[PDB]
Swiss-Prot record, chain A:
Cross-link named Glycyl lysine isopeptide (Lys-Gly) (interchain with G-Cter in SUMO1), sites: K173
Pfam families to which the protein is assigned, alphabetical: Ribosomal_L13e
Numbered residues of crosslink Glycyl lysine isopeptide (Lys-Gly) (interchain with G-Cter in SUMO2): K122, K144, K173, K176
Taxonomic lineage of the native organism: Eukaryota, Metazoa, Chordata, Craniata, Vertebrata
Function text: Component of the ribosome, a large ribonucleoprotein complex responsible for the synthesis of proteins in the cell. The small ribosomal subunit (SSU) binds messenger RNAs (mRNAs) and translates the encoded message by selecting cognate aminoacyl-transfer RNA (tRNA) molecules. The large subunit (LSU) contains the ribosomal catalytic site termed the peptidyl transferase center (PTC), which catalyzes the formation of peptide bonds, thereby polymerizing the amino acids delivered by tRNAs into a polypeptide chain.
Keywords: Acetylation, Cytoplasm, Isopeptide bond, Phosphoprotein, Ribonucleoprotein, Ribosomal protein, Ubl conjugation
Subunit structure: Component of the 60S large ribosomal subunit (LSU).
Species: Oryctolagus cuniculus (Rabbit)
Gene from which the chain derives: RPL13
Annotated positions of the N6-acetyllysine modification: K15, K176
Official protein name in the record: Large ribosomal subunit protein eL13
Residues found modified as Phosphoserine: S76, S105
Compartments where found: Cytoplasm
UniProtKB/Swiss-Prot annotation, chain B:
HAMAP family found in the cross-reference section: Ribosomal_uL15 (MF_01341)
Subunit relationships: Component of the large ribosomal subunit.
UniProt PTM comment: Hydroxylated on His-38 by MINA.
Main location: cytoplasm
Region (Disordered): 1-36
Gene behind the chain: RPL27A
Regions annotated as coiled coil: none
Positions with biased composition (Basic residues): 1-29
Protein name according to UniProt: Large ribosomal subunit protein uL15
Segments traversing the membrane: none
Cellular component aspect of the GO annotation: cytosolic large ribosomal subunit
Keyword Ribosomal protein found: yes
Residues with the (3S)-3-hydroxyhistidine modification: H38
From Swiss-Prot, chain C:
Protein name in UniProt: Large ribosomal subunit protein eL15
Organism of this sequence: Oryctolagus cuniculus
Chain intervals for the UniProt region annotation (Disordered): 164-185
Family according to the record: Belongs to the eukaryotic ribosomal protein eL15 family.
PANTHER family in UniProt: LARGE RIBOSOMAL SUBUNIT PROTEIN EL15, RIBOSOMAL PROTEIN L15
Recorded name of the encoding gene: RPL15
Biased composition (Basic residues): 168-181
Covalent link (Glycyl lysine isopeptide (Lys-Gly) (interchain with G-Cter in SUMO2)) residue numbers: K82
Any Pfam family the entry gives: Ribosomal_L15e
Stored InterPro entries: Rbsml_eL15_core_dom_sf (IPR024794), Ribosomal_eL15 (IPR000439), Ribosomal_eL15_CS (IPR020925), Ribosomal_uL23/eL15/eS24_sf (IPR012678)
UniProtKB/Swiss-Prot annotation, chain D:
Main localization (coarse): cytoplasm
Positions carrying N6-acetyllysine: K61
The family this protein is said to belong to: Belongs to the eukaryotic ribosomal protein eL36 family.
MF terms (GO), sorted A to Z: structural constituent of ribosome
Xref: InterPro entries: Ribosomal_eL36, Ribosomal_eL36_sf
Coiled-coil features, chain-numbered ranges: none
GO cellular component: cytosol; ribonucleoprotein complex; ribosome
GO BP, sorted A to Z: translation
Protein name in the entry: Large ribosomal subunit protein eL36
Described function: Component of the large ribosomal subunit. The ribosome is a large ribonucleoprotein complex responsible for the synthesis of proteins in the cell.
Gene from which this protein is expressed: RPL36
Stretches the record annotates as Disordered: 8-30
Comp. bias (Basic residues): 12-30
Domain of life: Eukaryota
Length: 210, 147, 203, 102, 52
RNA sequence: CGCGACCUCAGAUCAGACGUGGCGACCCGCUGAAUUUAAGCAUAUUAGUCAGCGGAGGAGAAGAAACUAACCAGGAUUCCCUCAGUAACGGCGAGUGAACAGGGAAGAGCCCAGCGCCGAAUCCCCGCCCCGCGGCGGGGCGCGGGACAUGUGGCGUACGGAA
RNA sequence: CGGCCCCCGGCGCGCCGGGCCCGGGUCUUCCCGGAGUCGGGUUGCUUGGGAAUGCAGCCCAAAGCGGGUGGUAAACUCCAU
């Protein structure tokens, strides 16, 4: 029974919602449970980073965002073949590897290669034996590092490029942004139909010959 | 605070603030928005016009990511950049014309609401308005698109 | 090998060579009981693709399933309620008939566990299926690292819970926009999350 | 001039170069290998044709392709699979007539 | 019921507002005695001692 | 008119094991209403909810795309927020009502059939010896049996693989 | 960040008896796909899914530069995955 200017409300309480009420008094205990397991996870892998393997440079789909850079699922095999690391060795060394990721662009490929190239430089690979085999690390690199890396390894900086204050020329001033935008909007709508008027007229030019 | 509630002042009154002739029954008018067309029609007509009926076409799988287009006006344009950018303008005998990247901050279309101070600029946006251009071109700037 | 030709021969079921074979088999299995053990698979390549290996402990059965839908188990009328639920004849059972064959195989043989089943013929009144059973305690499976996962007590009676391929299709689970349900744990879990009103500490 | 990367119209999107890459092996599936082609003709040689195809043999003989296509559409399914059924059966007529006119 | 609104959330600026007024009221000894504390012999109300 | 293999099917107080039943707060697979609302009521709503049935586990289920997207593209599954009380459904009435993306918690990938190549190169059981045996295992010896060519084991699975 | 005495567990080191002598890159030659299943018609249930989201009974029932998907049914053509 509405009276004197309320909104037409549609509460979804017509079901027996009281049997399925989810209380959140577990929130502080769940935070301790997650945190005490997070510290325990980091103590089992003593020299390894707590966050885990390295994540790639990934741009957003869904043109709403279209500019933000996320932390991806893993490095693709096309990115790994450039850097020279086999796909079954990158998992063991601490590189996230997924086979599903395609690579349509080129600048994003070198972004992930450069991320992997300088990652191998700062990586401290411990030898399997105490007597170090070939292509391990020197004993001088070990003793000054007995700590992990809190947070994600190489945190991804959403960076922009600073522009130089350009001097506007008259050649730029003649450009009409609204007039060109409306022209391109009309060309996209009429691109398919204009291909019909040309082809039947060209077929009508065949009637001139035949 | 139940001690500030109206129920504490109603202790003693027989009807408890809900009428003596018509008692507070369970649901006199009906549960919810009962009777949109019947017996509650006047309230729906003179307070919520256009509540009933269909209008327009139906778009089945509508995604908000395609129709994302945040707008910014020319009056709030120099707030996109720092204060030292605009004070280092109309100076040095060059016409510095600093570049303001609209897409970098998180806006797409630039609208022409407001008054633009007299300083030529370069604006980088995915969309523009007709009235937006003539204010910038009237000042002496230039618009550059980006994708 | 010969496994490729046997596969592609069985895809031409309308061809007259297969109509003779499907006629003789469906006649033969109709004279037997509704549930009995087969010693060797009628379709060897189809059994191997579903996980059957010809070694010790891999048992197969054959179960006859009556053809038709599901008549509602109520008396003559006696469907008291709104006129929606007055239909009893044209009702279809939500689970597949092949999954019923797996269900009945494990009900009779509770010691073994079903891997999967496959089609061996049908009649207008009956459907015939062959279900692969695995001894969990036979040392040929018990000592094999590829097949001792079924010996775990998690996979107790997969036919009851719809974990086989015939029961997985009836649940309507999968990836993508085509389903938009079973997006939690199962279809029941998808209904749960959308109906439990989450009340926080601070709201 | 004024070649700007417009957001709409026949060239929309940010201008990025595309690297040439080999196609995935997942995309290979469905290609006819000569070995499975060597298997498939023997199966068609042994078990023969289906009853619905053998009825459609004569409609191709009398040049009644519109009714033949309508029969396959009611018998197989959609028009894409109904069309593709027709020419390979029409290739049976071409192979059999050539093998008979020797 | 268990799902009554037990917890109340206050804005961080408001939570930081009262602590600035609580620390500033630790001075002005008329406030401290009005609480009831015996301060008459304290040499100075902002008692700062060493790190020892 | 018999013997001897093979296939199908029996009898076992045969030798050695396995399942039944209970609990069932959470989960999975079915079956499954009417109270109630729509001021009546029949679609709708209650609700795939109550009841009934079967099945386990300490978690279960799901899970590594016949995916989302149309982007300068993301990338197993599970949970929270947000999208959202939105697109959409509805005697378009009551009401019902998701999903993408993004930020997080966690994050691990793989194995077969087939295609092939290796002298069945494989596996189960019985007897003897050594070790330890109160979650019956490791090695050796046995023209000691059986399974297996109606296909066991190794390489090998879409990220290509093999020679 | 106290003490004493038992029992159990995992991580390290050594010994014995075994199994295993298993890489990557370039070039050449080969192979690679799961059927009464997809799909279509119809029926019933369900779903926000609306010219049918999903699940089932019946009938028809495949192909391999193929098939599935690209939220309006159908035909043609480029594509994307």
């Amino acid at each position: 029974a509405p009276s004197r200017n309320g909104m037409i409300l549609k509460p979804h309480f017509h079901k027996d919602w009281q049997r399925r009420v989810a209380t959140w008094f577990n929130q502080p205990a769940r935070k301790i449970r997650r945190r005490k397991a997070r510290q325990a996870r980091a103590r089992r892998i003593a020299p390894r980073p707590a966050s885990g393997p390295l994540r790639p440079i990934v741009r957003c789909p869904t043109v709403r965002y279209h500019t933000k850079v996320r932390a991806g699922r893993g490095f693709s095999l096309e990115e790994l073949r450039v850097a020279g690391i086999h796909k079954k060795v990158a998992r063991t060394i601490g590189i996230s590897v997924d086979p599903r990721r395609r690579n349509k662009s080129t600048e994003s490929l070198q972004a992930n290669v450069q991320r992997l190239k300088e990652y191998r430089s700062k990586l401290v690979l411990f030898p399997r034996k105490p007597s170090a085999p070939k292509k391990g690390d020197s004993s001088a690199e070990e003793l000054k590092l007995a700590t992990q890396l809190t947070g994600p390894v190489m945190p991804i900086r959403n960076v922009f490029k600073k522009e130089k204050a350009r001097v506007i020329t008259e050649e730029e001033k003649n450009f009409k942004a609204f007039a060109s935008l409306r022209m391109a909007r009309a060309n996209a709508r009429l691109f398919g139909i204009r291909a019909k008027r040309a082809k039947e007229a060209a077929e009508q030019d065949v009637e001139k010959k035949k | 605070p139940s001690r500030l509630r109206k129920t504490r002042k109603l202790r003693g009154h027989v009807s408890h603030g809900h009428g003596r002739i018509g008692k507070h029954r369970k649901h006199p008018g009906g549960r919810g928005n009962a009777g949109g067309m019947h017996h509650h029609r006047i309230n729906f007509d003179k307070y919520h016009p256009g509540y009933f009926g269909k209008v327009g076409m139906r778009h089945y799988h509508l995604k908000r990511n395609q129709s994302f287009c945040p707008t910014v006006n020319l009056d709030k344009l120099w707030t996109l950049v720092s204060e030292q950018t605009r004070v280092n303008a109309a100076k040095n005998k060059t016409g510095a014309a600093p570049i303001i990247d609209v897409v970098r901050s998180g806006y797409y279309k630039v609208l022409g609401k407001g008054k633009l101070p007299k300083q030529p600029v370069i604006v980088k946006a995915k969309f523009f308005s007709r009235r937006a251009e003539e204010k910038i071109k009237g000042v002496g700037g230039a618009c550059v698109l980006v994708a | 090998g010969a496994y490729k030709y046997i596969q592609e021969l069985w895809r031409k079921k309308q061809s007259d060579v297969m109509r003779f074979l499907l006629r003789v088999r469906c006649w033969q299995y109709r004279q037997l009981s509704a549930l009995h053990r087969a010693p060797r698979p009628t379709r060897p390549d189809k059994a191997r693709r579903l996980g059957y290996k010809a070694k010790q402990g891999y048992v197969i059965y054959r179960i006859r399933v009556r053809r038709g839908g599901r008549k509602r188990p109520v008396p003559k009328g006696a469907t008291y309620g709104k006129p929606v639920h007055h239909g009893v004849n044209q009702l279809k059972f939500a689970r597949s008939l092949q999954s019923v064959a797996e269900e009945r195989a494990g009900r009779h043989c509770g010691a073994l566990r079903v891997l999967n089943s496959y089609w061996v013929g049908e009649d207008s009144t009956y459907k015939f299926f062959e279900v692969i059973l695995i001894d969990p305690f036979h040392k040929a499976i018990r000592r094999n690292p590829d097949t001792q996962w079924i010996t775990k007590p998690v996979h107790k009676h997969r036919e009851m819970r719809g974990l086989t391929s015939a029961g997985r299709k009836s649940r309507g689970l999968g990836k993508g926009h085509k389903f938009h349900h079973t997006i939690g744990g199962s279809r029941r879990a998808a209904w749960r999350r959308r109906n439990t009103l989450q009340l926080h500490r601070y709201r | 001039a004024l070649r700007y990367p417009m957001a709409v119209g026949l060239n929309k999107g940010h201008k990025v170069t595309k690297n040439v890459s080999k196609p995935r092996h997942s995309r290979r599936r469905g290609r006819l290998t000569k070995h499975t082609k060597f298997v498939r003709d023997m199966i068609r040689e042994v078990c023969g044709f289906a009853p619905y195809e053998r009825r459609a043999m004569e409609l191709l003989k009398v040049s009644k392709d519109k009714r033949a296509l309508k029969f396959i559409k009611k018998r197989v399914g959609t028009h894409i699979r109904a069309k593709r059924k027709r020419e390979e059966l029409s290739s049976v007529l071409a192979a059999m007539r050539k093998a008979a006119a020797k | 019921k268990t799902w009554r609104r037990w917890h109340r959330r206050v804005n961080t600026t408001q939570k930081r507002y009262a602590i600035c007024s609580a620390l500033a009221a630790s001075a002005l000894p008329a406030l401290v005695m009005s609480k009831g504390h015996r301060i008459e012999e304290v040499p100075e109300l902002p008692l700062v001692v060493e790190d020892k």
